[PDB]
Write a protein that holds these residues in place. Structure first.
Motif, short mmCIF file in Angstrom:
data_model
loop_
_atom_site.label_atom_id
_atom_site.label_comp_id
_atom_site.label_asym_id
_atom_site.label_seq_id
_atom_site.Cartn_x
_atom_site.Cartn_y
_atom_site.Cartn_z
N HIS A 156 0.84 -1.19 0.00
CA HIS A 156 0.00 0.00 0.00
C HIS A 156 0.88 1.25 0.00
N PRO A 157 0.52 2.29 -0.76
CA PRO A 157 1.38 3.47 -0.84
C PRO A 157 1.29 4.37 0.38
N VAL A 158 0.10 4.46 0.96
CA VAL A 158 -0.13 5.36 2.09
C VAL A 158 0.26 4.70 3.41
N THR A 159 -0.25 3.50 3.67
CA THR A 159 0.07 2.81 4.91
C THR A 159 1.42 2.10 4.87
N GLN A 160 1.98 1.91 3.68
CA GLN A 160 3.31 1.31 3.54
C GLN A 160 3.38 -0.05 4.23
N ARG A 161 2.32 -0.84 4.08
CA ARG A 161 2.28 -2.18 4.64
C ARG A 161 1.80 -3.16 3.57
N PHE A 162 2.41 -4.34 3.56
CA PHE A 162 2.16 -5.30 2.50
C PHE A 162 0.74 -5.86 2.59
N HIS A 163 0.17 -6.13 1.42
CA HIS A 163 -1.17 -6.68 1.31
C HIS A 163 -1.09 -8.13 0.87
N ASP A 164 -1.98 -8.95 1.40
CA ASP A 164 -2.04 -10.34 0.98
C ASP A 164 -2.48 -10.41 -0.48
N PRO A 165 -2.00 -11.40 -1.23
CA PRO A 165 -2.41 -11.51 -2.63
C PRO A 165 -3.91 -11.71 -2.75
N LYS A 166 -4.49 -11.11 -3.79
CA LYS A 166 -5.93 -11.21 -3.98
C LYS A 166 -6.34 -12.67 -4.19
N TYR A 167 -5.56 -13.42 -4.94
CA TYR A 167 -5.81 -14.84 -5.17
C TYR A 167 -4.86 -15.65 -4.30
N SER A 168 -5.42 -16.38 -3.34
CA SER A 168 -4.60 -17.22 -2.48
C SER A 168 -3.83 -18.23 -3.33
N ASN A 200 7.64 -14.53 -9.69
CA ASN A 200 7.99 -14.14 -8.33
C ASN A 200 7.09 -14.78 -7.29
N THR A 201 6.30 -15.79 -7.65
CA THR A 201 5.43 -16.48 -6.71
C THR A 201 6.13 -17.62 -6.00
N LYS A 202 7.41 -17.83 -6.26
CA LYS A 202 8.18 -18.94 -5.70
C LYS A 202 7.36 -20.23 -5.72
N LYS A 203 6.92 -20.59 -6.92
CA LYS A 203 6.22 -21.85 -7.14
C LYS A 203 6.26 -22.19 -8.62
N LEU A 204 6.74 -23.39 -8.94
CA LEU A 204 6.81 -23.88 -10.31
C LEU A 204 5.98 -25.15 -10.43
N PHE A 205 5.39 -25.35 -11.61
CA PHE A 205 4.42 -26.41 -11.83
C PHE A 205 4.91 -27.38 -12.90
N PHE A 206 4.84 -28.67 -12.60
CA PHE A 206 5.03 -29.75 -13.58
C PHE A 206 6.43 -29.67 -14.16
N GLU A 207 6.59 -29.55 -15.48
CA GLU A 207 7.90 -29.74 -16.10
C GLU A 207 8.92 -28.74 -15.58
N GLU A 208 8.54 -27.46 -15.52
CA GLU A 208 9.49 -26.45 -15.07
C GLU A 208 9.99 -26.77 -13.67
N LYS A 209 9.09 -27.22 -12.79
CA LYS A 209 9.50 -27.64 -11.46
C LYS A 209 10.41 -28.85 -11.53
N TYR A 210 10.05 -29.84 -12.35
CA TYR A 210 10.81 -31.08 -12.39
C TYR A 210 12.23 -30.84 -12.88
N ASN A 211 12.40 -29.99 -13.89
CA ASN A 211 13.72 -29.75 -14.45
C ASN A 211 14.56 -28.87 -13.54
N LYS A 212 14.11 -27.64 -13.30
CA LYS A 212 14.85 -26.69 -12.48
C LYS A 212 14.51 -26.94 -11.01
N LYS A 213 14.91 -28.11 -10.53
CA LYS A 213 14.65 -28.54 -9.16
C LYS A 213 15.97 -28.60 -8.41
#
Ligand SMILES: [Mg+2]
Ligand SMILES: [Mg+2]
Ligand SMILES: [Mg+2]
Ligand SMILES: [Mg+2]
Ligand SMILES: [Mg+2]
Ligand SMILES: [Mg+2]
Ligand SMILES: [Mg+2]
Ligand SMILES: [Mg+2]
Ligand SMILES: [Mg+2]
Ligand SMILES: [Mg+2]
Ligand SMILES: [Mg+2]
Ligand SMILES: [Mg+2]
Ligand SMILES: [Mg+2]
Ligand SMILES: [Mg+2]
Ligand SMILES: [Mg+2]
Ligand SMILES: [Mg+2]
Ligand SMILES: [Mg+2]
Ligand SMILES: [Mg+2]
Lengths: 258, 103, 62, 53, 220, 106
Positions: free
Chosen positions: B45-57, B82-95
Motif C-alpha cells: 500500500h502506498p499510504v500505509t506502507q504495509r504489504f497486502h495479501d495476494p488477492k488470489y490465495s 515471483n510467486t516462488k512456485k513452479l508447476f510440472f515440467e518447469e519444477k521437475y527440471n529446475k529442481k
RNA sequence: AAGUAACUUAAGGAUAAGAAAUCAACAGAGAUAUUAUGAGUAUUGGUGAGAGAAAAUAAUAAAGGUCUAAUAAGUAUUAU
RNA sequence: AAGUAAUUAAUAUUAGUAAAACAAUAAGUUAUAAAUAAAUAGAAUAAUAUAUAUAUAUAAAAAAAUAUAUAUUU
RNA sequence: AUAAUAAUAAUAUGGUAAUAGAACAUUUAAUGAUAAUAUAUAUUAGUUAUUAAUUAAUAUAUGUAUUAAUUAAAUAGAGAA
C-alpha cells in the motif's frame, strides 16, 4: 479306445415365437440361447431369489414400547421390606399388567438380505425357463427383426393399445373393449398377467387399469423373480427379453483352447 | 471461436472477466493502487506502507494456473515468476535437489 | 465393532496357523545360573492348544 | 406350424415346436394332449389343480 | 400353478435353531443350557477371564515393533507366468515389456497392489519365456532364470502415487488431463538398492541423471 | 456378437430337442478362463479331502461310469454324485488323474 | 462412565463449518458437511480396563467463491 | 409374564463362481509363499529330502523348527 | 450303487447338568381350488401307536377359509418368580 464314449455337444438355441399384442398371431421365429429360456428347473436357486426379494421388500414397522419407552415414573411402587407383598420396582417391568414388552424391537427393524450377483442372474433365467417350458411366455416383437409373416393391420407390434386416450365418447373407450375381448378370446380373464415393456406404455396401463387385482405392467429394469413366477401368463417384448438376457448372461473370457 | 467461451471451467472464466489478459500485469510487487498489480503477488500500500495479501490465495492461483495449462492458455495469465512456485515440467527440471540426497 | 486386544497383539504374533510368543524369565537376576541351561529361556515358542481358543477371540483380525 | 394352429383353432407351446421335428410328431402330440380334454371336458386341466386325477 | 408354492431350500442349507426355556422335554428346559447357579447362570463374564491368575496376555514380554515404513510387495512366481503362456493368456505384442500395468490387465496379479510385485522363481527350471520383464524387484534365482531363457529384467522405483498412475493412467488423463511424472528416489536405501547391478536397478542399468547429479556433488 | 442370431444363421442340430443330448450323453463345460472344472475341497476342519466335478450338463451317472472305467484304481464306493447340482464327488484327492481323463475328449 | 445426565443463557427456520499461515512428500491434491473402504490402521494406556486417526478412493451436494479490509501486536513466540 | 436386536470375528453344511471370489465407477477385501523384531532376503544348479527358502551360526556346510516342489500350477 | 414299505439274524433303547437329531399346536406374509349337500367353534360317542387330526349326532354363527401343501418370520406353547 474311446476315452469318453458318451460325451457330446449340447444344443445352444431354443425357438421362441414373435407375435403381435392385441392378437397373439405368430410373425417370425427368433432363436434364443438355451441358457435364458431352456434351463433345468433348479428350485433351490429360485428359492434363494424369492426369499431375497421378499426380505428386501419388508417395511419392518414393528415397534412395541419397551420398559424404557413406557411412560411411568422410575419410583419404587412399594417398600422393599415389611409390606408383606412381592418385591416390585418401577411400574414398567414386563411382568406387570401395564408394563412394556421385554426385548422390545424398535422400528425401523432391519430385514435386509444380500445375494451374489451371479446367483441372482441364474435364478432370473431359471424363472423365464420355467415359464417358457410351461408354454406361458409370449413374445411381442417386430420392427427390428426379419419378418416372415406380415403384421395384421389392426394389430400393433408392441405391448401398447392405441386410441385409449380418445375417451371423448361414452363411459367406455376403445382401449378397454380391445382388452376385454383379448382377455376373453384367449381365455385369460381372471388369470394373472404380467406385461414387461421396454418403455412406459401409457396405453397398456390405462387399458389394464380396471384389472389391478390380476394384471400388472412392469418395465424392463424393474421386473423381479417373484413377479415372473407369480404370473401364470407372461407377456414380454422381444426388446425387453434381449435386455434381460444381456443383463443376466454368464460372462465368458477368451477361453481359447485346442 | 467465441463459442469456446463456455468450454472453459468456471474458475478460468471468472479470472479472465475479473483480470482481462489485455492489461499487462507487472511481474513484481508494486503499489496496490497501480493498475498493473499482480493478483498473485503481495502488493504494498502506498499510504500505509504495509504489504497486502495476494488477492488470489496460493490454492486459487494454483487452481487457475492448472486449468490454464490444460487448455493452452499460458501467456494470457499474469506472470507468476515471483510467486516462488513452479508447476510440472518447469519444477521437475529446475529442481534444487536436496542436500541429504546429494550428500 | 470388535476391537483387537492390544496387550495380546504386542506379545503374540501370527505365524502360520498358530501364534508366536516370547519366553518369560530372562529379564533380570540371571547371574549364577548355567548359561547353557538358560539358553532354553531365550527365543520364541508356539501357542499351546489349551489357550488357542482364547487367542482367536482376543485377536479376531489376526 | 402357424397353418396347423390357425386352422386347428388351438395353440401349441413354443417348446413343443422347437423339440418336435416331423409332422408325424406334431400329429401324435396334438392327438395325445389336446384331444383327450377336448372330447371329455371333465378330463381337463386346472391350473389350481395340477396334481389331479 | 405358480411355483411359489413348491419352492424349497437345497438340502443341508438350513437347520433349526435351539430354543431356550420353552419346555422340559424340549431338552433345553428351565435352565436352558446355563447350568446350575453361578455367575454365568444369571450374568456375563469375559470368556477369556482366567479368575485372577496372571493372564496369558501379561505373563510374557512385549515383543518386536511395527515397521511403519514397510513396503510389502505382492508375489508372482515364474511358474504362473509360464502357466499363463502355456494356457495362451499372455497377449504380449512383440517388443512389449511385462510391467505392472500388463500384469494387472492380463490377470497375472489380481487384487489391490499398493507398492509393487516382486518376481520369485518357483518354476525356474520350466521357465523358457524370452519376454522382457519389469517389476519392483526380483530374486537372484529369478534373474538367472529370466536371463537363461534369453529374456531380461529391470527393477523400477514407483511411489504409491506413481504406481497408481503407472497402473491405470487413463484415470489421470480423464480427470486431470495429465499423467503425473514419476518421482525420483529420495531415500538413501532406495537409491542404494536401485544402483546395484546385482539387483538390476534402473538407475544403474539405464544410467539416469540422478546418479550423475549425485556423483558431481560428491566430488565437488 | 448378438445374443439372438438370425433365423437363417441357426441350423437344425443347434435346436433343443434334437441330437438326443439328454439321453446317454454328457458334456462338461470349461471354466471362465478355460480350465477343467475339477477342484479339491478339505472338509470338517481339513481332516477329509474330496474331489468335485462341476458344470455337468446331461447324464451324470454315465459320466461317473465312464470315469470309473478309466480309473479303476479308485474304489467303486469312493464315487458319489449329488443330483441337485450334478456334482461327482470322489472320497480322495484325484484332481490330477480326473483332469487327465477329462481333457482327452473335452 | 463423560464434557454424558442435569441447571443456566441466546438466536434462526434451521444453527455450526467453509474458500488453507490445509494435507502430502521431491510426485501432487485444491473450501465446508454426511456416509463407505482405508481401519480396528498408525497412535495411546496403573502399556490394565480400554481408547484410536489421517492421507487417498468412492456416494449425496449446490453456479460454489467471493471480498465486505486502507491486510491486522500486548499478536505470534517464550516461561508457567 | 422370560435367549431379542445392531455392529464385528472364528468354525460347520449347502448353493454360486473357482486359481481365483465378492464388487464394479474407482477403490477395497480374501486367497494365491513360507519366515523373521526388522531389513535391500525368499523354495529341486540334475529329483523326495540326502535337494531348496527363512530364522541362529558360517567362508560354505552340519545342526534345530516350519514350508516348497515326484497331462496338469492349489 | 436310489427312495418307500415289508421280511430274517444280531446289537442297542433308565437318566439330573449337558450335547446332538426330528416333529406338533397358535399367529403373520408369498402361492393357493372348493362352498349352506359347506366352513368355524363347543359337547358327547368312535378311528388312527393319538401333545394331533379325523367320523357321526347335537347347538350357534357365516353365502363364508390367508383353508391343503412348500417356504419366510415370530409378542410361537405356563402349577411354578
Ligand atoms: Mg532380553
Ligand atoms: Mg537341563
Ligand atoms: Mg436335560
Ligand atoms: Mg453351586
Ligand atoms: Mg434356579
Ligand atoms: Mg456354572
Ligand atoms: Mg474424557
Ligand atoms: Mg454443552
Ligand atoms: Mg451460518
Ligand atoms: Mg461463519
Ligand atoms: Mg472414518
Ligand atoms: Mg498479513
Ligand atoms: Mg503454553
Ligand atoms: Mg434314553
Ligand atoms: Mg432369511
Ligand atoms: Mg409369549
Ligand atoms: Mg394361565
Ligand atoms: Mg404342564
Amino acid at each position: 479306445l474311446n476315452p469318453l464314449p458318451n460325451a457330446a455337444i449340447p444344443p445352444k438355441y431354443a425357438l421362441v415365437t414373435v407375435r403381435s399384442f392385441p392378437s397373439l398371431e405368430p410373425l417370425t421365429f427368433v432363436p434364443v440361447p438355451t441358457s435364458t429360456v431352456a434351463a433345468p428347473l433348479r428350485r433351490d436357486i429360485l428359492w434363494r431369489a424369492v426369499v431375497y426379494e421378499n426380505d428386501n421388500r419388508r417395511v419392518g414397522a414393528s415397534n412395541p414400547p419397551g420398559r424404557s419407552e413406557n411412560g411411568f415414573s422410575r419410583r419404587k411402587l412399594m417398600p422393599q421390606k415389611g409390606s408383606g407383598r412381592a418385591r416390585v420396582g418401577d411400574a414398567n417391568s414386563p411382568t406387570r399388567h401395564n408394563g412394556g414388552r421385554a426385548l422390545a424391537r424398535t422400528a425401523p427393524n432391519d430385514y435386509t438380505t444380500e445375494l451374489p450377483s451371479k446367483v441372482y442372474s441364474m435364478a432370473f433365467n431359471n424363472a423365464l425357463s420355467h415359464q417358457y417350458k410351461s408354454g406361458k411366455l409370449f413374445v411381442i416383437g417386430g420392427e427390428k427383426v426379419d419378418l416372415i409373416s406380415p403384421t395384421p393391420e389392426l394389430d400393433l407390434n408392441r405391448l401398447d393399445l392405441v386410441n385409449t386416450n380418445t375417451v371423448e365418447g361414452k363411459e367406455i373407450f376403445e382401449g378397454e373393449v380391445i382388452f376385454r375381448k383379448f382377455l376373453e378370446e384367449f381365455q385369460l380373464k381372471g388369470k394373472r398377467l404380467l406385461f414387461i415393456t421396454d418403455k412406459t406404455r401409457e396405453g397398456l396401463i390405462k387399458s389394464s387399469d380396471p384389472y389391478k387385482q390380476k394384471v400388472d405392467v412392469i418395465q424392463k429394469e424393474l421386473v423381479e423373480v417373484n413377479d415372473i413366477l407369480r404370473a401364470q401368463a407372461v407377456f414380454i417384448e422381444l426388446e425387453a427379453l434381449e435386455y434381460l438376457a444381456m443383463a443376466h448372461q454368464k460372462e465368458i473370457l477368451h477361453s481359447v483352447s485346442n | 471461436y467465441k463459442q469456446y467461451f463456455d468450454s472453459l471451467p468456471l474458475k478460468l472464466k471468472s479470472f479472465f472477466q475479473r483480470y482481462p489478459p489485455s492489461i499487462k500485469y507487472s511481474p513484481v510487487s508494486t503499489s496496490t493502487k497501480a493498475i498493473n498489480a499482480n493478483p498473485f503477488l503481495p502488493n504494498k500500500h502506498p499510504v500505509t506502507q504495509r504489504f497486502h495479501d495476494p488477492k488470489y490465495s496460493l490454492r486459487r492461483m494454483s487452481d487457475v494456473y492448472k486449468l490454464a495449462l490444460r487448455y493452452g492458455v499460458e501467456e494470457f495469465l499474469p506472470p507468476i515468476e515471483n510467486t516462488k512456485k513452479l508447476f510440472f515440467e518447469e519444477k521437475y527440471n529446475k529442481k534444487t535437489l536436496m542436500k541429504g540426497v546429494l550428500l | 465393532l470388535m476391537k483387537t486386544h492390544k496387550g495380546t497383539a504386542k506379545r503374540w504374533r501370527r505365524t502360520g496357523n498358530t501364534f508366536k510368543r516370547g519366553i518369560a524369565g530372562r529379564k533380570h537376576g540371571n547371574i549364577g545360573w548355567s548359561h547353557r541351561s538358560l539358553k532354553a529361556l531365550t527365543g520364541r515358542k508356539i501357542a499351546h492348544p489349551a489357550y488357542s481358543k482364547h487367542l482367536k477371540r482376543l485377536l479376531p483380525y489376526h | 406350424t402357424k397353418f396347423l394352429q390357425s386352422k386347428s383353432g388351438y395353440l401349441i407351446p413354443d417348446y413343443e415346436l422347437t423339440t418336435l421335428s416331423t409332422p408325424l410328431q406334431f400329429k401324435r402330440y396334438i392327438k395325445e394332449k389336446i384331444l383327450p380334454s377336448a372330447n371329455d371336458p371333465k378330463l381337463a386341466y386346472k391350473e389350481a389343480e395340477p396334481n389331479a386325477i | 400353478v405358480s411355483i411359489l408354492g413348491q419352492l424349497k431350500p437345497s438340502d443341508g442349507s438350513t437347520k433349526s435353531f435351539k430354543r431356550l426355556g420353552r419346555g422340559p422335554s424340549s431338552g433345553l428346559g428351565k435352565t436352558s443350557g446355563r447350568g446350575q447357579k453361578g455367575q454365568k447362570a444369571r450374568g456375563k463374564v469375559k470368556s477369556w477371564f482366567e479368575g485372577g491368575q496372571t493372564p496369558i496376555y501379561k505373563l510374557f514380554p512385549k515383543i518386536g515393533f511395527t515397521n511403519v515404513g514397510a513396503k510389502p510387495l505382492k508375489e508372482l512366481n515364474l511358474k504362473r507366468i509360464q502357466w499363463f503362456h502355456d494356457k495362451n493368456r499372455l497377449h504380449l505384442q512383440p517388443g512389449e515389456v511385462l510391467d505392472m500395468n500388463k500384469m494387472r490387465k492380463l490377470g497375472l496379479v489380481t487384487g489391490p497392489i499398493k507398492y509393487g510385485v516382486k518376481i520369485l522363481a518357483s518354476g525356474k527350471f520350466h521357465y523358457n519365456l524370452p519376454i522382457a520383464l519389469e517389476a519392483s524387484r526380483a530374486s537372484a534365482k529369478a534373474i538367472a532364470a529370466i536371463e537363461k531363457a534369453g529374456g531380461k529384467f529391470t527393477a523400477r522405483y514407483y511411489t504409491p502415487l506413481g504406481l497408481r498412475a503407472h497402473l491405470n493412467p487413463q484415470w489421470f488423463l480423464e480427470k486431470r488431463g495429465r499423467v503425473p511424472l514419476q518421482a525420483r528416489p529420495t531415500k538413501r536405501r532406495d537409491i542404494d538398492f536401485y544402483s546395484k547391478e546385482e539387483k538390476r536397478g534402473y538407475l544403474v542399468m539405464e544410467k539416469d541423471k540422478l546418479l550423475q547429479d549425485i556423483k558431481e556433488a560428491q566430488n565437488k | 456378437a448378438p445374443i439372438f442370431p438370425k433365423l437363417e444363421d441357426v441350423k437344425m442340430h443347434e435346436l433343443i430337442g434334437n441330437n438326443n443330448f439328454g439321453k446317454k450323453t454328457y458334456y462338461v463345460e470349461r471354466s471362465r478362463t478355460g480350465n477343467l472344472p475339477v477342484y479339491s475341497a478339505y472338509k470338517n476342519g481339513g481332516n477329509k479331502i474330496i474331489t468335485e466335478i462341476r458344470k455337468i450338463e446331461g447324464d451324470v451317472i454315465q459320466l461317473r461310469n465312464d470315469l470309473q472305467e478309466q480309473l479303476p484304481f479308485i474304489p467303486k464306493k469312493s464315487w458319489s454324485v449329488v443330483m441337485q447340482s450334478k456334482k461327482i464327488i470322489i472320497k480322495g484327492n484325484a484332481v490330477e488323474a480326473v483332469k487327465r481323463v477329462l481333457t482327452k475328449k473335452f
